[PDB]
Ligand SMILES: *[C@@]1(O[C@H]2[C@H](O)[C@H](O)[C@H](O)O[C@@H]2CO)O[C@H](CO)[C@@H](O[C@@H]2O[C@H](CO)[C@@H](O[C@@H]3O[C@H](CO)[C@@H](O[C@@H]4O[C@H](CO)[C@@H](O)[C@H](O)[C@@H]4O)[C@H](O)[C@@H]3O)[C@H](O)[C@@H]2O)[C@H](O)[C@@H]1O
């Protein structure tokens with residue numbers, strides 16, 4: 374209900390989102406995964422600009438906006454690949470199952486603390502993971518997760534819960 378430490382937050386309806394939440398869950402997404410996805414886009418989709426307008430290791434793919442550094446470091450299907458091969462990450466834009474599998478491989482590779490740091494701030498986050506900005510990003514995700522956990526209707530309805538987290 375009340376927003377996380379100083380932040381703006383709220384909720385609104387997105388047509389079709391409930392059916393999409395169900396698809397994400399059936400692909401293996403947990404409530405934490407749904408909260409991460411919910412922060413990134415409204416419809417849990419990949420129609421955002423290619424790479425989220427970033428190239429190389431910072432390029433974002435899939436519904437979670439995973440970056441290429443983390444994908445190539447953690448996920449078997451990208452093993453051994455380099456920063457310049459980032460266009461290969463676009464496979465996740467058309468395969469939800471692979472997107473979720475890669476998310477789980479990445480979270481296990483890093484552990485969740487480091488994972489949040491890299492997911493928010495890339496290589497700079499991995500080497501400086503305990504910043505105020507990373508903590509606020511994590512807090513936003515866990516606040517969204519709390520809304521999902523508090524009422525299971527939110528796992529399948531059209532409601533989007535959000536916290537304003539400035540883009541970087
Ligand atoms: C999203 O917007 C929300 C909004 O916050 C609010 O909730 C509103 O109601 O709804 C909107 C959605 O409809 O907000 C998130 C959070 O800001 C945006 O996230 C963006 O995407 C990812 C995942 O969260 C992150 O991207 C990283 O960005 C960093 C910094 O550029 C990159 O780090 C670099 O990595 C390089 C390679 O290693 C390295 O050389 C460099 O030094 C640096 O370390 C990293 O690779 C990722 O690209 C980030 O969180 C980003 O803002 C989301 O797009 C949307 O706006």
Ligand SMILES: [Cl-]
Nearest residue numbers: 501502503504
């Ligand atoms: Cl730090």
